[PDB]
């Protein structure tokens, strides 16, 4: 029961962080025509990908905890359904950010190999 609570506490935290990191990526806007802003944008996004990587460990940890909870057989019908929906969401929201962050990294690095 404390498992099911420690899990759900980490889930809201990572999930919230995930909406925030989306927020951040979608505020960044467009890559600069100015090679000077671009380099800044590039070195900023590299700290973003460092941050991404660390939170990738948290997402997996919650995926492990969630799964094992299901696996114990010790969850009720509803409890299981919910842990199941939560991991869909965690999987899908993570992958959506992870892909856009990788695009951005590529577009940023490509536009600097060009211009800088």
Author numbering: 338 to 453
The article reads:
Dystrophin is a large (427 kD) multidomain protein expressed in skeletal and cardiac muscle where it binds to the dystrophin-associated glycoprotein (DAG) complex of the plasma membrane and to F-actin connecting the cytoskeleton to the membrane. Utrophin (Utr), the 395 kD autosomal homologue of Dys is widely expressed in non muscle tissues (reviewed) but is restricted to the myotendinous and neuromuscular junctions of differentiated muscle and is located at the sarcolemma of developing fetal muscle. Dys and Utr potentially act as cellular biomechanical shock-absorbers limiting damage to the plasma membrane with the spectrin repeat domains acting as spring units by undergoing force-induced unfolding. Dys and Utr-SR1 adopt the canonical spectrin repeat fold comprising a triple helical bundle displaying an approximately cylindrical structure of overall dimensions ∼60 Å length and ∼9 Å radius (between backbone atoms).
The Dys N-terminal (repeat 1) spectrin repeat (Dys-SR1) also crystallized with two molecules in the asymmetric unit but there is no relationship between the two crystal symmetries. Based on sequence analysis Dys repeat 1 has been previously defined as amino acids 338–446/7. Comparing the structure of Dys-SR1 with Utr-SR1 results in rmsds of 0.8–1.9 Å (112 Cα) depending on which of the four molecules in the asymmetric unit of the two crystals are superimposed in a pair-wise manner. Dys-SR1A and Utr-SR1 (A & B) form the more typical conserved interaction between W354/W324 with helix B H392/H362 and helix C W431/W401. Instead of forming the usually conserved interactions with H392 (heptad ‘d’ position, helix B) and W431 (‘a’, helix C) Dys-SR1B W354 stacks against R395, one helical turn distant from 392, and is associated with both a twisting of the bend region in the centre of helix B and a crystal contact (M387 distance 3.5 Å) from a crystallographically-related molecule. This disruption of sidechain interactions relaxes the Dys-SR1B main chain so that canonical helical main chain hydrogen bonds are formed in contrast to Dys-SR1 monomer A and Utr-SR1.
